[PDB]
Amino acid sequence: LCYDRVFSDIIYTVASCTENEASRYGRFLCCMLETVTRWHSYENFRHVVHKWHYKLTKASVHCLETGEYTHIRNILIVLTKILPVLNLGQALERRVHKICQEPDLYALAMGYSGQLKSRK
């Protein structure tokens, strides 16, 4: 239940960070995420971790395709921190659209897109 509530409500907690508390929040998020993916692999657990990843990427695209400067900045630095198929493609397309639509946010978006292309 704790992991559920941490993976679900990600949106506003991310939106409410002072440009580096988003980094400190992504650090712990990626730590517990790599914990889950480590002791993940088992069928029901595979389904529930699929649901977690789905809710996470859904909140991510929802926060990216809209939700001006503070939201997109915080979610960009967080997605960079948790960087280590269809969901990945959709997130990459939305991030590329947000990047091409555009200062420093464009640089962060280009860096995240490059990291995603490398980790493709």
Next chain:
Amino acid sequence: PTLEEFFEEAIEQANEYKAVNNSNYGWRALRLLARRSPHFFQPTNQQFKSLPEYLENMV
């Protein structure tokens, strides 16, 4: 301000030029809803389209 000295208007105003349309206040409301308002971490999960919609319901 503890949830009542801060807003003081949202309850009294409930969207062209309102107060829940400004991010410089909506951000601080999200910073204040973190310390208090136990219904913040509550698993709502209803996919509110915009932050003003989620914010007005939490006031």
